[PDB]
Write a protein that binds this ligand. Structure first.
Ligand SMILES: CC(C)CCC[C@@H](C)[C@H]1CC[C@H]2[C@@H]3CC=C4C[C@@H](OC(=O)CCC(=O)O)CC[C@]4(C)[C@H]3CC[C@]12C
Ligand SMILES: CC(C)CCC[C@@H](C)[C@H]1CC[C@H]2[C@@H]3CC=C4C[C@@H](OC(=O)CCC(=O)O)CC[C@]4(C)[C@H]3CC[C@]12C
Ligand SMILES: CC(C)CCC[C@@H](C)[C@H]1CC[C@H]2[C@@H]3CC=C4C[C@@H](OC(=O)CCC(=O)O)CC[C@]4(C)[C@H]3CC[C@]12C
Ligand SMILES: CC(C)CCC[C@@H](C)[C@H]1CC[C@H]2[C@@H]3CC=C4C[C@@H](OC(=O)CCC(=O)O)CC[C@]4(C)[C@H]3CC[C@]12C
Ligand SMILES: CC(C)CCC[C@@H](C)[C@H]1CC[C@H]2[C@@H]3CC=C4C[C@@H](OC(=O)CCC(=O)O)CC[C@]4(C)[C@H]3CC[C@]12C
Ligand SMILES: CC(C)CCC[C@@H](C)[C@H]1CC[C@H]2[C@@H]3CC=C4C[C@@H](OC(=O)CCC(=O)O)CC[C@]4(C)[C@H]3CC[C@]12C
Ligand SMILES: CC(C)CCC[C@@H](C)[C@H]1CC[C@H]2[C@@H]3CC=C4C[C@@H](OC(=O)CCC(=O)O)CC[C@]4(C)[C@H]3CC[C@]12C
Ligand SMILES: CC(C)CCC[C@@H](C)[C@H]1CC[C@H]2[C@@H]3CC=C4C[C@@H](OC(=O)CCC(=O)O)CC[C@]4(C)[C@H]3CC[C@]12C
Ligand SMILES: CC(C)CCC[C@@H](C)[C@H]1CC[C@H]2[C@@H]3CC=C4C[C@@H](OC(=O)CCC(=O)O)CC[C@]4(C)[C@H]3CC[C@]12C
Lengths: 148, 243, 49
């Protein structure tokens, strides 16, 4: 999982930095940029694509709910690249690193299961001697056995 | 490891040797004639410094640290707004690109064949070299577009963002050295073919549903490229939990 | 189905990938041995050298 998290971190930071640096051109130095790098790409792995912010309509005039003419803010340059690199990121992440982690979990399952069963059977002795050496009284009442 | 004993908790000792030069002399060096692998066949302190700085592991970690610092800087110049002229961090990044291009050119010139076309071919046989040349050319055209006025500056910024995508993907080259990460990376590269066949079949089914939905729900439409976008837009995000 | 084809080809790809990485260790080592000492941001000094 850690190696998977490393590769996800590389791909996630690439997409997040690209999206933030395209959609927000005029930004002051602030720690919110680093948060915006990680925020939306991370929740895109778990079924939340933030569909209202994939490609909002901008650079036209669209009537509001009351029918008044509302002028959208102009198009950012290269804003059409954000859905394309988002498509590539979602495909790579959700289809490749999750399924590859499934594969490496599946193909190492038997050896790990046998070693885990045998190590548990070995550590039964450690558990038994530890509980044999502990006092009778529980931790909330162990002060009496301690003064004893 | 070069001319260095070590072989105990690797990486950290050479990183503290690189960041702290007075940490180099506190390390156990190998003998003068223990295993002298050579190419063509205060003084001990200088000998230790020269033996440390010519080791391939030290050169690798020092390359890796330079690449990480460069990537952090190019993050700083793509996240923060840029003025009419580049800042100091952008100048360091541009210098990094120019010197890396000069290094790749020197690697082209110092190869095995005689004829220049043969050298170019044997250097482009590696895919990473081709993507390096493409990315250096893209950085050049983006920086040229950026040094002009508007609206070319925003185009240069866009090219900078696409290049940062590439340099994050190229961080896997540094990951290729670890005994577990490198096989993982080329394993991913092997499964890309199965993913491609999967993408082909998904493309057929996705385009079928998208064309059917758009052609049913929107009967009276003029010829416009938005129809092709509406073919792919909603069916693609329906795969990832957004119906 | 992509999960299935990823799972059933995992072992052969893993063995070939490990062996190919062990083969390319030499290429990595000779390449880093032939590179200059100075990093790419400072390689202009070694280049004029
Ligand atoms: C590659 C994967 C496996 C890991 C990478 C993802 C995390 C490192 C990211 C994803 C969401 C991030 C968090 C999203 C939001 C916040 C809140 C932020 O605090 C605020 O914004 C202050 C409160 C406010 O202003 O509303 C501090 C960073 C933190 C915890 C972030 C820390 C880094 C997190 C956990
Ligand atoms: C190889 C990978 C791990 C690289 C990832 C790099 C980025 C995640 C880092 C590297 C440099 C960081 C920047 C370094 C300095 C600053 C200035 C800082 O500004 C302030 O804190 C305001 C100053 C003040 O008023 O005191 C805000 C965070 C920011 C943009 C940082 C945001 C996150 C950056 C881009
Ligand atoms: C390497 C793998 C195995 C683990 C993942 C580690 C990093 C990806 C995490 C760990 C600590 C995280 C940082 C912890 C705190 C912050 C401050 C946070 O600042 C704010 O949210 C400022 C408040 C605001 O402006 O809203 C921005 C994210 C950041 C840099 C986090 C970015 C992601 C980091 C570097
Ligand atoms: C060897 C590797 C693992 C790390 C080396 C990288 C860092 C030492 C660099 C990379 C990005 C750098 C930052 C990029 C940008 C800035 C903003 C900069 O502030 C300004 O440019 C505005 C104010 C001023 O002019 O000082 C101050 C330095 C700082 C935090 C830099 C501090 C040093 C950082 C963290
Ligand atoms: C070799 C590269 C790839 C990474 C090495 C890391 C450091 C040697 C660099 C990275 C970021 C640099 C900093 C980025 C920005 C600044 C702000 C800069 O401020 C000014 O120049 C203000 C006055 C002016 O406007 O001219 C002073 C240098 C400094 C601290 C730089 C000092 C050198 C730093 C720490
Ligand atoms: C923000 C968006 C655009 C994410 C970027 C997605 C792609 C541009 C990246 C994501 C993962 C990358 C792959 C990760 C791993 C590898 C293996 C590596 O190839 C090798 O090591 C050669 C040996 C082999 O292919 O087995 C580099 C190419 C490749 C396919 C990469 C190609 C580019 C990919 C598909
Ligand atoms: C079968 C799977 C694996 C791949 C098929 C999906 C992609 C080929 C599709 C899905 C989403 C599509 C994108 C969705 C939206 C846009 C924005 C569009 O630009 C605009 O609409 C301009 C800005 C605006 O009008 O808001 C250009 C095409 C593009 C990048 C599309 C290109 C084709 C994409 C990446
Ligand atoms: C086997 C698979 C790959 C078939 C997929 C076919 C469609 C994705 C293509 C084939 C023909 C294309 C059409 C060919 C011509 C036009 C006219 C074009 O109209 C204009 O550009 C306006 C003309 C002007 O005013 O200049 C808008 C796109 C559209 C409808 C195209 C939309 C996409 C279509 C239907
Ligand atoms: C074959 C597999 C392995 C890769 C997938 C390739 C195609 C499915 C992609 C690649 C290029 C894409 C095209 C790139 C650009 C456009 C223009 C785009 O036009 C607009 O969005 C017009 C703006 C608007 O009206 O909003 C519509 C989608 C389309 C035809 C894309 C449709 C999907 C295409 C053909």
């Amino acid at each position: 999982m850690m190696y998977f998290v490393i590769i996800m971190l590389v791909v996630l930071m690439s997409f997040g930095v690209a999206r933030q640096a395209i959609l927000f051109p005029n930004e002051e130095p602030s720690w919110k940029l680093a948060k915006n790098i990680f925020y939306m790409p991370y929740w895109m792995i778990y079924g939340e694509v933030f569909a209202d912010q994939i490609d909002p309509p901008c650079g036209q005039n669209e009537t509001r709910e009351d029918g008044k003419i509302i002028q959208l803010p102009p198009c950012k340059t290269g804003a059409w690249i954000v859905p394309a690199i988002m498509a590539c990121y979602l495909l790579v992440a959700n289809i490749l690193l999750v399924n590859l982690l499934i594969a490496v979990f599946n193909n190492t399952f038997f050896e790990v299961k046998s070693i885990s069963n045998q190590v548990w059977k070995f550590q039964r002795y450690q558990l038994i001697m530890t509980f044999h050496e502990r006092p009778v009284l529980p931790p909330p009442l162990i002060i009496f056995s301690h003064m004893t | 490891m070069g001319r260095l004993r070590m072989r105990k908790n690797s990486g950290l000792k050479v990183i503290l040797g690189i960041l702290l030069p007075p940490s180099i002399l506190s390390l156990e060096f190998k003998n003068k004639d223990d295993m002298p692998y050579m190419t063509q066949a205060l003084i001990p302190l200088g000998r230790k410094i020269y033996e440390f700085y010519n080791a391939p592991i030290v050169k690798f970690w020092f390359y890796t640290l330079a690449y990480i610092g460069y990537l952090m800087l190019f993050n700083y110049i793509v996240l923060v707004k840029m003025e009419r002229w580049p800042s100091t961090q952008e100048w360091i990044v541009i210098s990094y690109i120019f010197t890396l291009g000069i290094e790749k050119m020197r690697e082209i010139l110092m190869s095995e064949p005689g004829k220049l076309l043969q050298k170019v071919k044997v250097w482009l046989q590696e895919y990473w070299n081709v993507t390096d040349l493409i990315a250096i050319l893209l950085f050049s055209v983006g920086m040229i577009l950026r040094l002009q006025d508007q609206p070319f500056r925003s185009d240069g910024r866009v090219i900078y963002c696409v290049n940062i995508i590439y340099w994050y993907i190229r961080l896997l080259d540094i990951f290729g050295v670890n005994k577990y990460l490198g096989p993982y990376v080329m394993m991913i590269g092997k499964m890309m073919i199965d993913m491609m066949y999967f993408v082909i079949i998904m493309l057929v089914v996705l385009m079928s549903f998208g064309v059917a939905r758009q052609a049913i729900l929107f009967p009276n439409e003029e010829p416009s490229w938005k129809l092709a976008k509406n073919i792919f837009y909603m069916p693609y995000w329906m795969i990832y939990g957004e119906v």
